[PDB]
Amino acid sequence: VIMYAXXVXXXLXXGXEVQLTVTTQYGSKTTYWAQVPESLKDKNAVXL
Amino acid sequence: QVGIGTLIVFIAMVLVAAIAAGVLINTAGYLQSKGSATGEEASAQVSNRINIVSAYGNVXXXXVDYVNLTVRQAAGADNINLXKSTIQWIGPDXATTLTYXXXXXXENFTTXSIKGXXXXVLVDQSDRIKVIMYAXXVXXXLXXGXEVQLTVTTQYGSKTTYWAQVPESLKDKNAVXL
Amino acid sequence: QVGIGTLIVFIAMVLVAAIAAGVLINTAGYLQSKGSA
Amino acid sequence: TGEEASAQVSNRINIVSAYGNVXXXXVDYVNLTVRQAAGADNINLXKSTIQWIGPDXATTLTYXXXXXXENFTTXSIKGXXXXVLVDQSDRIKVIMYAXXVXXXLXXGXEVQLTVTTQYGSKTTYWAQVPESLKDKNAVXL
Amino acid sequence: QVGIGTLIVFIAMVLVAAIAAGVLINTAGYLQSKGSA
Amino acid sequence: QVGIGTLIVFIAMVLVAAIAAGVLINTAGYLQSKGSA
Amino acid sequence: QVGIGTLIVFIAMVLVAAIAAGVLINTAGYLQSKGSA
Numbered sequence A: 001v002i003m004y005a006x007x008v009x010x011x012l013x014x015g016x017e018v019q020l021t022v023t024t025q026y027g028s029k030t031t032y033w034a035q036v037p038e039s040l041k042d043k044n045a046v047x048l
Numbered sequence B: 001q002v003g004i005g006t007l008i009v010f011i012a013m014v015l016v017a018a019i020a021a022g023v024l025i026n027t028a029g030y031l032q033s034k035g036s037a038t039g040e041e042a043s044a045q046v047s048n049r050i051n052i053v054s055a056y057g058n059v060x061x062x063x064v065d066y067v068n069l070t071v072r073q074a075a076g077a078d079n080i081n082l083x084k085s086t087i088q089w090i091g092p093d094x095a096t097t098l099t100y101x102x103x104x105x106x107e108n109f110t111t112x113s114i115k116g117x118x119x120x121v122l123v124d125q126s127d128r129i130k131v132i133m134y135a136x137x138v139x140x141x142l143x144x145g146x147e148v149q150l151t152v153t154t155q156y157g158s159k160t161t162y163w164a165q166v167p168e169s170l171k172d173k174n175a176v177x178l
Numbered sequence C, E, F, G: 001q002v003g004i005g006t007l008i009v010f011i012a013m014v015l016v017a018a019i020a021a022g023v024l025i026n027t028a029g030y031l032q033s034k035g036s037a
Numbered sequence D: 001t002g003e004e005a006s007a008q009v010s011n012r013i014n015i016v017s018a019y020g021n022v023x024x025x026x027v028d029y030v031n032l033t034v035r036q037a038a039g040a041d042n043i044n045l046x047k048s049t050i051q052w053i054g055p056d057x058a059t060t061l062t063y064x065x066x067x068x069x070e071n072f073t074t075x076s077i078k079g080x081x082x083x084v085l086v087d088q089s090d091r092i093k094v095i096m097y098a099x100x101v102x103x104x105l106x107x108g109x110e111v112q113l114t115v116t117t118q119y120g121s122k123t124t125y126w127a128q129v130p131e132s133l134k135d136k137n138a139v140x141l
């Protein structure tokens, strides 16, 4: 699932946390607390 | 007619179970997110720690004016930011808690680089950053014998203590090792 | 009707235990890699 | 119920270090430096209470604004707010007048501080004054 | 009505876990202060 | 709800280990500085 | 007439859950005092 964060919000810096709820058509809800690593120094890709 | 009655009650049971089933899962949804985050932060607090390799100090006239520390990230430590860390100075005159700045003085410390690209972050195991502390701008210089207690604390809460004991004599020493 | 209600809740209890099982292993997975390092 | 109980267990307030002033020949202030625990949310120190089991008076301290009497005052060591811990890197110093709560503090005396947050998580710190305070401007209880 | 029974029993396990959780934290606090001293 | 109860108890264990780990490292910290002097 | 049956049985479940719920609450209380001491 693709999400352009610099267009949705304002491009997350370090530490910035986002709470996502993916709700299916029938109604089932899945929560994910995607928290950016507190440091992004010399990292090409991170694991939220 | 009894068939008509049980049908409507049956519709109630599937809806009542669905509500009970639903909130049973979303409650587990919150706790698993909190449980996952708690495990990561708890391990970070234990592991992401700063090791103090060495500490020296410039000597003017006969009183130590600067206190420098070469810091290195501990074993198995992720990125450590030296701007989100506070150094607590338990000296002979004051007891302030130093914070980060940008070129030292006052009740703030500055970090110059030694080996690395970033002069404020410990990216790899092989980087050393020098923590500049102005003793003449925090207390009242640092004469002989006057020891201070420094505890560098990272943002996660890891604490490293170092007793900077000035040499008992400061005569004919341009720079000494605290 | 009680049997029907039990079956729906049974699915939730199965799924809830799976979620609790999952985080337990995944947390241990991160810890072993951090511990090994 | 699930949300509240999880906050009760998880959101806790940790204590980094303690230090206090030394006037004449005794300790008059007992300052702290608190920090959020693993995954703790916003901790409002204005809604928390500190239980003081001292050598003399054993009371429960509430919050005020500059401290004396039976209250504590919270200054901000590092952060935007000075009464609530928001980020993991926030440090707030609580100030407690030991010459107002009790009759100052001498050597050997120990204080049992229980910092209970609003939700209920309790952190206990056994502040022990050093057994000698000769020629010390500040100590580390 | 089987779903109803789960709800209150669910609430119970939240509390007993909270009660169980506490006894370790405050106990470990004592050995924390005692061990340091 | 057995899974839900496991989660909160799991949060207890990590914190307790975090407290216990904090004791040993800081306790060794003072000994390190005292021993060096 | 079928709706009368599920009402009374519903009353049984909440009490049965409450009876069971208390059992863990009070039992956890004993080990809390037992464990703390």
Ligand SMILES: *[C@@H]1O[C@H](CO)[C@@H](O[C@@H]2O[C@H](C(=O)O)[C@@H](O[C@@H]3O[C@@H](C(=O)O)[C@@H](O)[C@H](OS(=O)(=O)O)[C@H]3O)[C@H](O)[C@H]2O)[C@H](O)[C@H]1O
Residues within 6 Å of the ligand: B056, B057, B058, B066, B067, B068, B112, B132
């Ligand atoms: C801890 O590390 C800091 C790193 O900056 C070091 O700082 C330097 O101390 C010098 C001195 O007080 O020891 C000071 O020296 C003056 O300025 C120099 C330069 O212009 O910066 C230079 O003119 C002269 O010193 S030197 O280059 O001959 O050594 C002197 O006039 C530096 O400015 C200062 O940054 C601390 O000394 C050390 O303890």
Ligand SMILES: *[C@@H]1O[C@H](CO)[C@@H](O[C@@H]2O[C@H](C(=O)O)[C@@H](O[C@@H]3O[C@@H](C(=O)O)[C@@H](O)[C@H](OS(=O)(=O)O)[C@H]3O)[C@H](O)[C@H]2O)[C@H](O)[C@H]1O
Residues within 6 Å of the ligand: A013, A014, B081, B082, B083, B084, B120, B121
């Ligand atoms: C190590 O930790 C330090 C802690 O101070 C951190 O320093 C801060 O970095 C911020 C950013 O560069 O990441 C910078 O943020 C300011 O505020 C931003 C926003 O309004 O919040 C933005 O205006 C600017 O930053 S940025 O969006 O262009 O990146 C900036 O004005 C803080 O000023 C800076 O102290 C380090 O980044 C970290 O490595």
Ligand SMILES: *[C@@H]1O[C@H](CO)[C@@H](O[C@@H]2O[C@H](C(=O)O)[C@@H](O[C@@H]3O[C@@H](C(=O)O)[C@@H](O)[C@H](OS(=O)(=O)O)[C@H]3O)[C@H](O)[C@H]2O)[C@H](O)[C@H]1O
Residues within 6 Å of the ligand: D019, D020, D021, D022, D029, D030, D031, D075, D095
């Ligand atoms: C615990 O934390 C409290 C936080 O307030 C701290 O309180 C301050 O102690 C100062 C001193 O160390 O006793 C005291 O100093 C006087 O007042 C200063 C100012 O007007 O506030 C200043 O005039 C003088 O001190 S200084 O600026 O030269 O250092 C002095 O007359 C502060 O008023 C007091 O709030 C405790 O010390 C600490 O233990």
Ligand SMILES: *[C@@H]1O[C@H](CO)[C@@H](O[C@@H]2O[C@H](C(=O)O)[C@@H](O[C@@H]3O[C@@H](C(=O)O)[C@@H](O)[C@H](OS(=O)(=O)O)[C@H]3O)[C@H](O)[C@H]2O)[C@H](O)[C@H]1O
Residues within 6 Å of the ligand: D044, D045, D046, D047, D083, D084
């Ligand atoms: C930590 O907790 C403190 C608790 O005092 C909080 O500060 C207080 O917040 C109150 C409110 O929650 O904003 C505010 O209350 C005032 O008085 C109320 C009433 O008359 O008693 C009411 O007018 C307003 O509040 S409210 O009813 O809308 O909630 C408000 O004017 C207190 O003045 C304020 O000190 C801190 O913010 C928190 O961090």
Ligand SMILES: *[C@@H]1O[C@H](CO)[C@@H](O[C@@H]2O[C@H](C(=O)O)[C@@H](O[C@@H]3O[C@@H](C(=O)O)[C@@H](O)[C@H](OS(=O)(=O)O)[C@H]3O)[C@H](O)[C@H]2O)[C@H](O)[C@H]1O
Residues within 6 Å of the ligand: D105, D106, D107, D132, D134
């Ligand atoms: C080395 O150890 C000696 C031990 O005698 C110590 O001196 C004594 O300290 C006492 C105290 O700890 O300050 C002091 O006690 C006096 O009497 C107390 C009471 O009336 O019995 C009380 O008034 C005062 O002490 S206290 O309650 O505040 O602790 C005090 O006036 C003794 O008189 C004193 O000889 C040295 O200080 C230490 O360096």
